Structure 1
Amino acid sequence: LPACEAEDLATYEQKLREWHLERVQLIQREQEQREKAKQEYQAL
């Protein structure tokens, strides 16, 4: 078990960084659609 903890903890740090990047993408995509929504109302 001691050896597995080191391996699992290393993967855990990688997952945290992967999750952080994916979360930022969702936040950015949300901002763009909301900005477009304003333009759509301006056209409407």
Structure 2
Amino acid sequence: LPACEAEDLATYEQKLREWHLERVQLIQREQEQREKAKQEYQAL
């Protein structure tokens, strides 16, 4: 088990960074569509 803890914790750190990047992408995509929504209402 001691050896597994080191490996799992290394993968855990990688997952946190992968999750952080994916979350940022979702936040950015949300901002873009909302900005487009304003343009749609301006056109409408």
Whether TM exceeds 0.5 here: the answer is yes
Q: After superposition, what is the alpha-carbon deviation per residue over 1:1-44, rounded to whole angstroms, capped at 9, x for unaligned?
A: 00000000000000000000000000000000000000000000
The TM-score normalised by the length of structure 2 is: 1.00
Cα RMSD (Å): 0.0
Whole-angstrom CA distance in 2 between matches of 1:22 and 1:3: 29
Q: Where does structure 2 lack aligned partners over 5 or more consecutive residues?
A: none
Q: Where does structure 1 lack aligned partners over 5 or more consecutive residues?
A: none
The TM-score normalised by the length of structure 1 is: 1.00
Give percent identity, aligned residues only. Answer: 100
Whole-angstrom CA distance in 2 between matches of 1:5 and 1:17: 19
**Structure 2 residue 34 is matched with structure 1 residue 22:** no
Whole-angstrom CA distance in 1 between matches of 2:36 and 2:3: 51
Number of residue pairs matched by the alignment:
44
